[PDB]
Amino acid sequence: GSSGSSGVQVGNCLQVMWLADRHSDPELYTAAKHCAKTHLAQLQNTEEFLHLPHRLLTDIISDGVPCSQNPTEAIEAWINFNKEEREAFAESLRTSLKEIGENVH
């Protein structure tokens, strides 16, 4: 019957992937990190995500994000937090931002 084990969840994906990266953990970091890029919104509407650094966020969006989960929206917010300086990261992040799914070269 319906049986499984403890793994990763879009909700606790950030926290997981975070520590993982800090502990040079590719297996985990990659896993959680992925689920994040796919479900960025679910995190963009949360504090943690906005509380995350630039290295983490950059990596996520760097791995390409599905047009489905409004990527820019998350960038604008996570940036607005401390736009005072993050601004620089906002522009650079925008140009770096990548979209998948749609047929565009």
Question: Topology of 12-105 in CATH?
Answer: 1.25.40
Cβ count near 76 (within 10 Å): 15
Q: Give domain limits for the chain.
A: 12-105
Rounded to whole angstroms, how far apart are CA atoms 36 and 40? 5
The residues with which 99 forms a beta bridge, in sequence order, are 65
